[PDB]
Amino acid sequence: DRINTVRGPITISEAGFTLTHEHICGSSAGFLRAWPEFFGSRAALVEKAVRGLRRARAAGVRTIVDVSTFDIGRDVSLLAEVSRAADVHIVAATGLWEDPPLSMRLRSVEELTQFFLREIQYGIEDTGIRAGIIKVATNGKATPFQELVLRAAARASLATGVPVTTHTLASQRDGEQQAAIFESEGLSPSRVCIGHSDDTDDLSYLTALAARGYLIGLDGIPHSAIGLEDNASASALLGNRSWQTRALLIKALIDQGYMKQILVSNDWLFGFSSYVTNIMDVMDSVNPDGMAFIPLRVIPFLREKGVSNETLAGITVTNPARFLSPTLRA
Amino acid sequence: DRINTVRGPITISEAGFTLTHEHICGSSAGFLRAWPEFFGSRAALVEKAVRGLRRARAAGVRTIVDVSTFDIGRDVSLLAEVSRAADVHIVAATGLWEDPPLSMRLRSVEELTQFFLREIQYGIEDTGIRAGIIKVATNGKATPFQELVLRAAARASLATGVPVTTHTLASQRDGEQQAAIFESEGLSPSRVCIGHSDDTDDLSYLTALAARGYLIGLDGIPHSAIGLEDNASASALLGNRSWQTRALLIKALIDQGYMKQILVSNDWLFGFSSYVTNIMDVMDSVNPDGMAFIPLRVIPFLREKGVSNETLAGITVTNPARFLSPTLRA
Ligand SMILES: CCC1(C)CCCCC1
Ligand SMILES: CCC1(C)CCCCC1
Ligand SMILES: OC1(O)C=CCC=C1
Ligand SMILES: OC1(O)C=CCC=C1
Ligand SMILES: [Zn+2]
Ligand SMILES: [Zn+2]
Ligand SMILES: [Zn+2]
Ligand SMILES: [Zn+2]
């Protein structure tokens, strides 16, 4: 009946329109503290994030789930500052992404479970802010350590009811192996979102996940390098499929009976240090709406394609609330 | 005429007996903040470090160089606390070790130079504490990013006079490639210590470095897994050569005319999270003297083998002061 945010517990009704996969800043552990000038300044990053979240709020967004883990350089004090200034709830994450340092990579499944439970049940470092979601990652076949991370995420979710959300290399159908590992630990698919699923057009893969009960994260809708002439790094990151192609996967899954299992987001950021320099400028030129892209551009697009207002409100309000509200079976 | 420590500038005379390659805690960026229970508690780690440094001080140590970089999880506030409580000077490091995160690995040589200069000239994150040494690393042939790190370290040293110290895989003769890269940037070998050089018995490699003017870091004297029955992880980390074999390399280089180029240390730690769990307990059982091993065991051993007190005072007092005092040519 309560979801943990960076400003404390909120009721399910208070979450409202929720973007389920976003980042204030995509970075690395300790990086913002040690080199704030990379972002201009910490204050410039804060100001940019507050302006972006205020524009998202004006477009109807009420909550974002920041799926930055320890190794994305999640700074919950930064999230709290931006959340207060913008009047947008922010749910923080535990888990591990694709860049864990040695002190994480050498840990056992039991040790990792203790760490994820610390961040859900006690607090993130000394802040008392508790995570409301567990983020994990693979890029193709899981490494041995990533198998431990997936298992520890399942154990933390089974103890607390907090859901799991994943990064995939969708072209390698990673959700299949992720699901197998989660289910081997006894985790309900209703507690799991297989993310970056809009990176693929393979309906057999997407429906195989949805048929088992997984939530499907169509979370990078504005990610596209179409019309970026000869930018190899942006093309590799964003892909060559249009935002319309990605958005039509929302309609595709609705038409197959999976409206209650779709989660939609932008996978946007206000700073981004874990990729090439100036990538944030390139991304902002592609999508000047930032996190407001979903309500301002995707929702009207889907309405014109015949999707109802009621169905889209279910996807953007009802589904995130059911996903985020702690439970063992949703 | 001044060396930066975690408590401010000290004179060259104040450095005294100096251990040139040590760690308060071998960790990862942000790890101690996010999971202090891994070490029991932060307070337990502090107490262990203070007791260890007090025993080292009683044995004659006056300064240690903590060569923990950003990616070793260097916490300069922790170093300052331990330094004040133990009455032992601590020099902090900038640079990058073998575990840089994506936000570092994607940077250019110019960006890395700015970061190293920030930590030498301005301060480490918001503390105002300035680094007195630059630490870099290879493990075999340098990766493309490690080549950039080595070049940026050379540029930072050329601008400031602060020396460079290295991690090597000594069996692969890494010092040869490190030297070639440093010299391509114009760095004087007198500003560089090639570390972990006691990991090898190859006198042709060691004398080739010393003949060019490099300082030779015989920095892991107590590291040995001899007498550890069937501990594969400790054997892989510590090696099967005795501490006496390592210590005799000090005499070997003295006998070849290189007494002024030898730097000696323990490469000890009080916490260690970047390796297998409980490694600190294994290491403490091998060497209960910790950082006091050099003065309590190595110095008397070398005296019995015929090395003079004057020569050993030159190695432990004069050489570190010449190395650490900022200059372009020492
Ligand atoms: C029948 C699928 C549906 C028209 C339901 C109402 C929202 C839009 C999709
Ligand atoms: C001649 C080498 C030397 C005996 C000099 C004094 C210190 C010990 C070594
Ligand atoms: O994996 C990601 O969602 C994280 C940050 C950026 C881009 C992609
Ligand atoms: O490379 C090292 O010196 C760092 C920490 C530990 C062990 C070795
Ligand atoms: Zn991702
Ligand atoms: Zn993301
Ligand atoms: Zn090393
Ligand atoms: Zn070391």
Author numbering:
A (entry chain A), B (entry chain A): 35 to 364
The study reports:
The enzyme phospho­triesterase (PTE) is capable of hydrolyzing such OP compounds. Accordingly, it has been characterized from a number of bacterial sources, including Brevundimonas diminuta (Bd; formerly Pseudomonas diminuta), Flavobacterium spp. and Agrobacterium radiobacter. The present study focuses on Bd_PTE, a dimeric metallohydrolase that has a (β/α)8 TIM-barrel fold with two Zn2+ ions embedded in the active site. Carbon dioxide reacts with the side chain of Lys169 to form a carbamate functional group within the active site, which serves as a bridging ligand to the α-Zn2+ and β-Zn2+ ions, both of which are required for full catalytic activity. The buried α-Zn2+ ion is ligated to the protein via direct interactions with His55, His57 and Asp301, and the exposed β-Zn2+ ion interacts with His201 and His230.
The crystals of tagged C23 (C23_2, C23_3, C23_4 and C23_5) and C23M (C23M_1 and C23M_2) grew from AS and glycerol, with one monomer in space group P43212, such that the canonical dimer is generated by crystallographic symmetry. In the case of the PTE variants, it was essential to confirm the identity of the metal ions in the active site. Accordingly, the X-ray data for C23M_1 crystallized from AS and glycerol were collected at the zinc absorption-edge wavelength (λ = 1.2724 Å) on beamline ID23-1 at the ESRF from a crystal that diffracted to 1.38 Å resolution, showing a peak corresponding to the zinc absorption edge. Notably, when AS and glycerol are used as precipitants, the binding of OP ligands displaces the cyclic compounds X3B or X3T initially observed in the apo structures.
